[PDB]
Ligand binder design. Structure first.
Ligand SMILES: N#Cc1ccc2cc[nH]c2c1
Ligand SMILES: N#Cc1ccc2cc[nH]c2c1
Ligand SMILES: N#Cc1ccc2cc[nH]c2c1
Ligand SMILES: N#Cc1ccc2cc[nH]c2c1
Ligand code: NA
Lengths: 301, 301
């Protein structure tokens, strides 16, 4: 089962889920064993504190049943890691708002703009009318590409001149979305790396200006991060969460990275729903995150 | 690849998968719509019981999600139909036995003998040695076709005179396969005229097999023809008569009634090992439920 997800997770599977099978084969449960396991979890980008949590519950659970063969750790690990992901299994529901405003935050070059396009096309396939706000206002090439993408797919894109105030663009977009009975408004934002404090105050300004038109907006604050960037994904999540308060995460580029295990760190450290995972190039490969599917593909033996 | 798979399903896609799109376009979610959808599933050979389950789950999930637009039923239906096939998505693994014995059951004229040849060539291509047993012993023309095929393809075929005891032929083939360290033995009657006979003959075959290897047959594989509820009915008969462990469904291409795969999956819960979607050896595809669903529900809008 799950042949496509298993292929996407091939490099992750070398260290997590099925990768544990060779690590445990014919070993006994002792400190040597748990030390090897901790090393492997850290190599897989699971994170220092998440790994310590797993080893602790795993060691206590082994002791209680007086488990002796390391092979018996497998089911316990699958349960422990499964519960980490279950806590952030919650599909995004955009129904019933006029418009449902998604604020897309995150650094440039990690699939934020790709994710906007795929979400837009999915929502329109669902029968919703979508509009985009080109809030990354100082990147003239990014804004023009977004506008060209909108013209190609008959989706309105609200934009202003290079250097325009992003909070102004997004205000004008909410106003236009409301006038045009738009169901989902997806607002891009700047993702420059220099000067982190400036970007964060810019996002807080956007949120305050939105609330001049709708106090429930933004209805979703969605971070996009790229699994191939390993722990940098965690550090980005922390920065954006502390600044504007995330309500959802999209984790892209799971296919072809050995660092997919960063999902556990993201899930455990923040408890924010992971709404979507990106497991390939298709629109349909931005998949709603389903924890038990992910675990099954990972641990399938 | 995936593009050939989509093309091979175009006729079934008229009414299932992407065939649902025109049905939902601009409609409200009400009983008229669910009635039309139920009728469309039944026409596609999904089956009364399986259709009732799909419609019930879809209706409940639409309510809970508070859906407004019929277009949004598409993703829920893709998930419901995908879950039916996920539950029978276990691949056949023929490795590690001397020989791995596949007992091929099914009626005559549904691609059973074609499937035997394609599997034999696929296994050979993977580096495994293969033997066939001509267990359809009262049909002289069929035995000779199988012998001719084995001659043409340099694969040994164990056979006896017309009217030989099937279980004895298969007994002799397992003996020979074991002596020659053959990796895979594929054993071929499929007469439904007196079904009480055919079924008792299968139980005799299995009993005799177990004299030489208590694990044999390692797989009991039914073959049925997707272009034929006859295929649903043959699976019921063989399922109750013998313990099926796998199912091959042939001729999915060029037929517009692709729902039998869903009815078979849901009613019996037996793994679907292979689907035949064309004339080439490789068009007998190891079944991947996720690939199949994606091809069936592929949409470009
Ligand atoms: N998916 C997606 C996508 C593809 C191209 C562009 C260009 C600007 N935004 C885009 C989004
Ligand atoms: N265009 C624009 C616009 C309109 C109102 C406010 C309020 C704060 N920024 C704004 C920008
Ligand atoms: N693939 C295949 C195939 C087609 C015809 C016969 C007849 C006896 N074995 C057969 C195998
Ligand atoms: N050829 C043949 C054969 C040999 C032994 C037994 C035992 C039961 N059936 C058998 C058939
Ligand atoms: Na499968």
């Amino acid at each position: 089962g799950f042949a496509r997800l298993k292929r996407s997770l091939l490099k992750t599977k070398e260290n997590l889920g099925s990768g544990f099978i060779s690590l445990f084969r014919g070993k006994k449960i002792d400190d040597d064993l748990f030390e090897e396991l901790e090393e492997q979890l850290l190599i897989a980008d699971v994170g220092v504190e998440t790994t310590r949590k797993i080893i602790t519950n795993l060691t206590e659970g082994a002791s209680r049943k007086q488990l002796r063969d390391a092979e018996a750790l497998y089911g316990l690990l699958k349960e422990e890691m499964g519960e980490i992901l279950a806590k952030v299994d919650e599909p995004l529901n955009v129904e019933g708002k006029a418009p449902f405003v998604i604020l897309m935050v995150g650094v440039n070059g990690v699939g934020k703009t790709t994710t906007i396009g795929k979400l837009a096309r999915q929502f329109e396939q669902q029968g919703k009318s979508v509009m985009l706000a080109a809030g990354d206002t100082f990147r003239a090439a990014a804004v023009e590409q977004l506008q060209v993408w909108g013209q190609r797919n008959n989706i309105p894109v609200i934009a202003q001149h290079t250097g325009a105030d992003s909070a102004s663009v997004i205000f004008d977009a909410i106003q236009a979305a409301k006038a045009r009975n738009i169901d989902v408004l997806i607002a891009d934002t700047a993702g420059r790396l220099q000067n982190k404090s400036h970007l964060m105050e810019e996002l807080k300004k956007i949120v305050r200006v939105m609330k001049k038109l709708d106090v429930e907006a933004p209805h979703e604050v969605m971070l996009t991060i790229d699994a191939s960037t390993g722990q940098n994904a965690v550090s980005q999540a922390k920065l954006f969460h502390e600044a504007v308060g995330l309500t959802g995460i999209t984790l892209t580029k799971l296919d072809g990275t050995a660092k997919g295990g960063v999902i556990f760190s993201v899930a455990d450290q923040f408890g924010i729903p992971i709404r979507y995972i990106g497991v390939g190039e298709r629109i349909e490969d931005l998949r709603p995150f389903k924890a038990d599917d992910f675990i099954e593909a990972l641990f399938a033996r």
